[PDB]
Swiss-Prot record, chain D:
Residues of the full protein shown: 148 to 182 of 732
The protein's assembly and partners: Homotetramer.
Protein name, as recorded: Acylamino-acid-releasing enzyme
Gene (UniProt): APEH
Tissue: Expressed in the liver (at protein level).
Family the UniProt entry places it in: Belongs to the peptidase S9C family.
Subcellular location: Cytoplasm
Described purpose of this protein according to its UniProt entry: This enzyme catalyzes the hydrolysis of the N-terminal peptide bond of an N-acetylated peptide to generate an N-acetylated amino acid and a peptide with a free N-terminus. It preferentially cleaves off Ac-Ala, Ac-Met and Ac-Ser. Also, involved in the degradation of oxidized and glycated proteins.
Amino acid sequence: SHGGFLSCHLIGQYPETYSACVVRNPVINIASMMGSTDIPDWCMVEAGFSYSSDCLPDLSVWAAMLDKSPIKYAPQVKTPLLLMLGQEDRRVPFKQGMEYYRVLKARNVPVRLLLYPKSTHALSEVEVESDSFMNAVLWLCTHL
Amino acid sequence: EPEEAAALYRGLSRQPALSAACLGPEVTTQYGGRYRTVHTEWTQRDLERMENIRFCRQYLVFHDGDSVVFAGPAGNSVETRGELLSRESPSGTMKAVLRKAGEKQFLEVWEKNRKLKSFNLSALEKHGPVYEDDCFGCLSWSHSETHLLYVADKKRPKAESFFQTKALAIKGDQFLFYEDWGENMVSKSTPVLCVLDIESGNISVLEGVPESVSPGQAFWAPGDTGVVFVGWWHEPFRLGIRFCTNRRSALYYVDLTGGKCELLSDESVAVTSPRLSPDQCRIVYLRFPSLVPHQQCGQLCLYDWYTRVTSVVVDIVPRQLGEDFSGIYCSLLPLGCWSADSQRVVFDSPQRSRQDLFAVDTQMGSVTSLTAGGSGGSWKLLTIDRDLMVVQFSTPSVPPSLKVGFLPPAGKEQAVSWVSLEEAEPFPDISWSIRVLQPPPQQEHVQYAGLDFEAILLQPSTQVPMVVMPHGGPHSSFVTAWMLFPAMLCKMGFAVLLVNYRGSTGFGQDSILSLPGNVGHQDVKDVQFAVEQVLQEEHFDAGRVALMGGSHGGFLSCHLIGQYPETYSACVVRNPVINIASMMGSTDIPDWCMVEAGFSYSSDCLPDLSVWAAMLDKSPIKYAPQVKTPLLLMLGQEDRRVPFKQGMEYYRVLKARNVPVRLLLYPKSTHALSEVEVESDSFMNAVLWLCTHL
Amino acid sequence: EPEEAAALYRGLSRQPALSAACLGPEVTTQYGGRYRTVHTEWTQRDLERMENIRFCRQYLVFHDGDSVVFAGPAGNSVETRGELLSRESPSGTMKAVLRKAEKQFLEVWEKNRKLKSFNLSALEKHGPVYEDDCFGCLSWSHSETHLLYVADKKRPKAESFFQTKALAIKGDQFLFYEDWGENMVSKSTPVLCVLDIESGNISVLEGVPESVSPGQAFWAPGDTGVVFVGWWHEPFRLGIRFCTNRRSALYYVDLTGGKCELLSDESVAVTSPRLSPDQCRIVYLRFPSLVPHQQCGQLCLYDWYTRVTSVVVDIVPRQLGEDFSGIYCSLLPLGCWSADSQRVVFDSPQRSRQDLFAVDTQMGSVTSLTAGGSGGSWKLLTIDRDLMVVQFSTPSVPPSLKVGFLPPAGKEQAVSWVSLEEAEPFPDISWSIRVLQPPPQQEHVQYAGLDFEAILLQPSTQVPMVVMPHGGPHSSFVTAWMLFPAMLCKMGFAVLLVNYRGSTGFGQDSILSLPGNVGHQDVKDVQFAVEQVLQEEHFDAGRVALMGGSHGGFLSCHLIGQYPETYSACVVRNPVINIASMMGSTDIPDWCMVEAGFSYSSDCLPDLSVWAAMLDKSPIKYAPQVKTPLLLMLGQEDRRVPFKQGMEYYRVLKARNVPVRLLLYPKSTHALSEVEVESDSFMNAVLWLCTHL
Amino acid sequence: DCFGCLSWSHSETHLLYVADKKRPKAESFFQTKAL
Ligand SMILES: *C(=O)[C@@H]([C@@H]1N=C(C(=O)O)[C@@H](S[C@@H]2CN[C@H](C(=O)N(C)C)C2)[C@@H]1C)[C@@H](C)O
Ligand SMILES: *C(=O)[C@@H]([C@@H]1N=C(C(=O)O)[C@@H](S[C@@H]2CN[C@H](C(=O)N(C)C)C2)[C@@H]1C)[C@@H](C)O
Ligand SMILES: *C(=O)[C@@H]([C@@H]1N=C(C(=O)O)[C@@H](S[C@@H]2CN[C@H](C(=O)N(C)C)C2)[C@@H]1C)[C@@H](C)O
């Protein structure tokens, strides 16, 4: 979630420190998340503006949102990454991870993507939880 | 009145439409006469069962030489269930059918009054589900009539969980992501070519297809030595393919055994619809030379099998080539399109506001119109065999009808005589006409000067209210054919105006290329000018004008109610485009937003402030605060080309300001809303909204 | 060899069979030619989908008014799904279809359009529609404005005593409703329904007597009323399927008012009425005795305007010439009248053949249209404007389709058949007919001089033989295409099918000879036929086997019990084992009383003498003597012959330590007709026979 | 645990809880009716 956002920022801004990364449902582009999330005021508040139900698009605001998102640093990434998305998540739409995945794949960076068609943000079902934990452990033990 | 509207819809929806036709072998009699049979397939809506039913019918044609002497029916209609694909053999003695039953998929071979053979594809376990669409699917007979060729999904390795219990597969791969080809292509990721031997019943998957292409539209090469197919590039990722002709692809030939594959055309443009000639010496196909627009004017090209020479038979038309031809705009050719001499080809294409039939000589390059002149109408060519054509004809006030004809010899194709096989009853209370519009001086394009456009007006045969419809696309158009909803509106007392603004297909390549980079400014003004001219000319009631549109047509309607708030009294939209910038990151065709905004598209892009501002400046949401027209919104929750959150954002903006809005959400429908129940419900709701608010 | 047998079965089961045919309207040409279309329906087994599939085909016939000039195909076959009944209109312009899709829909088609559709379930005027040949029907009005059919009567709603209602009769949920027996599950009381096409309204006719079940209805002349057949169901119902001895009568009822009148006698059985093209007279079949389940019948005629009834064709004791022996069909073709409204055509068994006959209703003469030759089986599917469509087959030739023209009166024997669809013969099978004369010690006390027949198939000595008696016992074998006998013949066996005294098609004396003698006269006829055939063809006497079902299994058990040294193997299907125990559990209790030699009464009570006779006539009495290995195959849901009879026989044999193999099908009836069950049973039987000989 | 609850009255004779609001029934424009 907000913790996957930070991890992508870290691997984009410090390309030498880390050698592996796993993210479940990261926030990737704050500007494009506003129109699809169930809590649009979160995007406004965390970017430094006041939310209003009558507010319309304003290019000045949309500039701040883009400058604070990890996608901006995509071209500098080299760390192998594992993505695990839930297709029914309503707070963080799963297209967010897809954009990052496409950007990384266009540059031949090693990426592994798992998609759970019936899971929400938490991936809390026993089968999904066990499979995701096993895959993450295997990734970490192999790439280190 | 809901009851009267329901009765009218019941009456209008009963008219069926043609889907396919084929011809049988010739038969001789001891008296010397000659006749042959025609097989046709029809589809019809059924409101009691709430489903689309499909049935078959057969006809008889007695001919003496190259002339039709008599035609008649040969029995009653028979309903069918579970047929995906079917193809008669070259000699006409056997028939191959793909069916779903049980569900499982079966391949059946019929001869006369017996089902000779059946194969259970699921049990053999050599591949996945078979493709039945028109993009990749096919079903072809060998020239020896011993083998069959088709396309099916590639087999995936078995996977299992880390914690399975075994009795006293790759672990962890159950949820690996497989990318599919987009809207109306759910679960279709990578096809493969499959060959079935009828005698032995063994299935093989051909080897040698390049790893980075998806194959399709395959047929047997001369001598049955190999297979010719079209490959679409899917690296680094797939872009929506349905309803687009600008996807990079090429033509390949592959040997039956060995793995050798050779390229037969260029590899930088789009190609489609290859057809081998009856003499087996040449191939004709369609080529689109730029990848920018989703629909455009195309070229007709020819390839010689034995000399290996490629040539251009028909080239791009900038504005017009005479008064009858304006370019090639069809996305496919008929399955049977060659004349008996293996020198001429026949097809159908839009031409301004009509749809006509054309014959092309592949040696000289001349194009001849077979249906020129008259008031108008829409023709469709279903097949040709031994110089006998089967066609469908319709107009805005006449449901589809079936005809047959003989293609005259070279140089006299305009003297064709049509014979009727199945006629339809007209509706004399609808009258239709075509209007031509010339943009005013202040609206001329900087580089393409002098373009004009058109509209189609239907009216009963200042008192009459009017409804305005722009088409989607934006590179599409309306043609003077049978349309259910406009006919219903006309029979309820409305007048209907369908607008083909600059950028529509069938008016030259200049019209196609004039629109990009100007969406939201040029088309809106074209529609407004047409509305004003029609109002001033026919003297309709200016206080009862309404709008109705889907997809890009909804985008235009929202723009219009936002920029001219005092002109329209009601509006109905379906799956509209509302915010291009936010749409870019969620649609299956991201290149469309960039192209229509006025920029080039490339993979490995990145968000930029300038491009995002340009996209935001062209969106109808910017005018939301000015709107005061009552609005009805209808959305499909599973639409993948236009996500349903655009309409939700528009709805929230309007709701926060106390504007009257009515929202309907269909949780299992796509962009089309083509299911019988959903379609009927949406049409009834729209008609009631229009009648109540005007 | 299981693989070779499976391949042979796959090859043989591919041949389709005809089920129905109809003719279309005549069409003229500017050149003067005249042609018309023929619509046919076929059915075929599919082993991959394990199901019976049905498809349709169409043909064209060009004629000159009295002769066929050309015939040809008019397209490919089209498979169909969910069609229960269908009927073309009198003028040939519309078509009515009953479909299931589950719900039931009545549809009307005209050219390339599904004009109308009606959802019967939603209207809620009746229950499921009848689709069988006993009660079901679907008829057009002469004005082509109304439709008539038959459906189950609506039952009042019921609910439990403890239902919870939001803030019907209580206790009637499990009331018993009696049905009509085997292959008639859940069918209790039908009713006549009329649908008006223009308005959409359904009505249930009033005036049917409370104590009858109506069926086989059609519109009366002038569309004033309806003519139907009513079967008595008091005090309780007896099995109706495959029986022609159920009491019934013919009734006419007005459309509105409730007046109902009787048109025939009320003490015998009547069936199969057909109105003439001119709408002046009606023919039907009458059976005057209720004792036997099949017998010789009469053909009777009724005049609409004079109200006079007469007998056109009467019972035949032994024979009427060398070509006719009586009427033994249970139904007439839907279209059976000549264009002059004076002659009728039908098909019937005749000794060991099945022939076509034409009858003049004014003079009463019967003429055979297919007399002479080696044999064969014909079936007439329809006639319209003097054009007949027929199916033909033989033991070594699968079914074929032909058309013909009926010659004028006095010359019907000169008919010329034109082939529409031919089948490929099997030249490795040869068949013949044998005649057998019982010896002096086996003559009947009252019917002296009767002889019987057998059909012998063989490849074209050390040849093994398989013997088959038919069920019934009032039934028979005819020289037609039979799948299993052909499969056996193609594997190297010889096959002998026996028509013992009491079979249909040999006169009423043969029918009446058997009752009261089951287990004695039928067992000795079969044994005599086997002995006679063995000594003449010089087959291997040490490799003779038996195979039979129902009454044929009863005979086979009797034979292996009374002649333990003659047969080396035996296969039976749903056999009758103990008549006395059968009486109290079957759906046709009168059969046990009649075949044992007594009369049946609805108020009968158990008696010692009758029970003793039934026990003395049962094969179980010979169980201790049996030593032949046995394969027994039973269907658990059979209602005419409960599956406990075979269980008792199996228990006795097992307790005596005899080799036995038992198969039980938990969802099958007496026929074992499902594709999977049928194939499994045939393969098991073939393997048993091959291994044990 | 945002809206749901289950409560006893002090007299212990009544119960209180929360549930979704009832919605009026609807039907298609083409539904067939029992004659
Ligand atoms: C991701 O961080 C998005 C949202 N913020 C949340 C947070 O507070 O961490 C989560 S919900 C929260 C986390 N664990 C609990 C939980 O998920 N369940 C009990 C199911 C509560 C939420 C996805 C953030 C970007 O808004
Ligand atoms: C909306 O217009 C979006 C896309 N453009 C379309 C168009 O060409 O009109 C449609 S698809 C096309 C229109 N009618 C056909 C159809 O819908 N079916 C056959 C189901 C094909 C498409 C959603 C545009 C904004 O991208
Ligand atoms: C067994 O023979 C029992 C009954 N008599 C029969 C007979 O006539 O042979 C059968 S029904 C008859 C035979 N073949 C047809 C058939 O089985 N189907 C169409 C399914 C009809 C019946 C069980 C006898 C002991 O009563």
